[PDB]
């Protein structure tokens, strides 16, 4: 059937324009019952309908974004596009294109979607992490101790413990993106409460994009 496929930049800097493109494939057939739409989905957040373009090229934009957007179509390329002006970190999201339809039984539904294209907005290019200890502070006789890997860009960061000798009870969590446009993550390991006096625990943080490695020893406080 018809398929929609998005293209995007991956990363854009604040104050710049975000340009996305949706190519329509598999037979199309231009019709006033179809509305070509953009919708974005926030990091673990809800959905926002951005606007559409329909038929002869008339547009309708979500009133809160109206002043920053242009949706246009290039039918010779079987594509339609979104320009979003002066983006900030709050514009980070997965952007989807979708076909809305007015046909009976399908009214006001989006009956075809693209896979989404992730867009990250940030002023950073390469910045290594600050590493802070999460000092141990149970029913199973264990204590959790960790490292906070803060304010780096871009992803990814890897963390091992004791040079990778400690893998048991180790969890390295997915990153959050801060309003600063910089990432933070944590790594934790669960170890015997009785060993907190005799045992050394060091998190090894590697951020290859900034060529930085940090070794941080984590003690009781």
């Amino acid at each position: 059937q018809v398929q929609l496929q998005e293209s995007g930049p991956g990363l854009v800097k604040p104050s710049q324009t975000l340009s996305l493109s949706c190519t329509v494939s598999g037979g199309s057939s231009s019709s006033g019952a179809h509305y070509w739409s953009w919708i974005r989905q926030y990091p673990g957040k809800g959905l926002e309908w951005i606007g559409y373009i329909h038929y002869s090229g008339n547009t309708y934009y979500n009133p809160s974004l109206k002043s920053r957007i242009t949706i246009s179509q290039h039918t010779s390329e079987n594509q339609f596009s979104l320009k979003l002006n002066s983006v900030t970190v709050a514009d980070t999201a997965v952007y989807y294109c979708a076909r809305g339809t007015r046909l009976r039984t399908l009214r006001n539904a989006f009956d075809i979607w693209g896979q989404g294209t992730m867009v990250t907005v940030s002023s950073a290019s390469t910045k290594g992490p600050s590493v802070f200890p999460l000092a141990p502070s149970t029913s199973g006789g264990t204590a959790a101790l960790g490292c906070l890997v803060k304010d780096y860009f871009p992803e990814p960061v890897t963390v091992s413990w004791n040079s990778g000798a400690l893998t048991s009870g180790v969890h390295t969590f997915p990153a959050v993106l801060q309003s600063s446009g910089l990432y933070s993550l944590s790594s934790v390991v669960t170890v015997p409460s009785s060993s907190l006096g005799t045992q050394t625990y060091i998190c090894n943080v590697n951020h290859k994009p900034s060529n930085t490695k940090v070794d941080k020893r984590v003690e009781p406080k």
């Binding site: 926002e48 979500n62 009214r107 006001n108 539904a109 997915p174």
Partner: protein, 210 residues
């Protein structure tokens, strides 16, 4: 906007209902409720439109209905492939589209597991850098959906809250984290802070104090 439960689950072969609660402007406004299924990384798919119409191509196990300002998606014989994120949508008489915030529907393939929750206060070292971060780490939970709420002296905190989507661990359980970004001065300016984790209708809470 539209209210869905963050999680729903059932074992293979069982049936499960997912609610979507709006106002009389949208759901009950008219019959323009639709539902969407989304598998990570794949195009969302329309599974129900005009409240109760199932498109050709969609498995007969999905059915929709509505009653009040509340619409519902029922999945009948749960199959592994039915595990996905589901969203409801409605047209509004204000000439716009509203969406729910989504429901993760897990088709149980192992025992439910309660999250291990750990809450760290800011390190003295971080405080020296003029930053304060509270760190709530949540691991080994299944199904892979949780709700986190932050509290400063029993009062709900919204600002400074940064929460990850759950990610699958190598044991097929899930991990997530939530951070509360504060200044050193607001850190010391409160009696205590709490991270409250809700999983499967059960709430566990950790608390720290400066």
């Amino acid at each position: 906007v539209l209210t869905q439960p963050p999680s729903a689950s059932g074992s293979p072969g069982q049936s499960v209902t997912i609610s979507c609660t709006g106002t009389s402007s949208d759901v009950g406004g008219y019959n323009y409720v639709s539902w969407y299924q989304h598998h990570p990384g794949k195009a969302p798919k329309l599974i129900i439109s005009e409240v109760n119409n199932r498109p050709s191509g969609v498995p007969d196990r999905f059915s929709g209905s509505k009653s009040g300002n509340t619409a519902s998606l029922t999945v009948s014989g749960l199959q592994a492939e039915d595990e996905a994120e589901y969203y409801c949508s409605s047209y509004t008489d204000i000439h716009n589209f509203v969406f729910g915030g989504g429901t993760k529907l897990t088709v149980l393939g192992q025992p439910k597991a309660a999250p291990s929750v750990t809450l760290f206060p800011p390190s003295s070292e971080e405080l020296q850098a003029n930053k304060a971060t509270l760190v709530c780490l949540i691991s080994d939970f299944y199904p892979g959906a949780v709700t986190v709420a932050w509290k400063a002296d029993s009062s709900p905190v919204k600002a400074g809250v940064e929460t990850t989507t759950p990610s699958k661990q190598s044991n097929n359980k899930y991990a997530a984290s939530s951070y509360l970004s504060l200044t050193p001065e607001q850190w010391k300016s409160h009696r205590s802070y709490s991270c409250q984790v809700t999983h499967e209708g059960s709430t566990v809470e950790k608390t720290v104090a400066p």
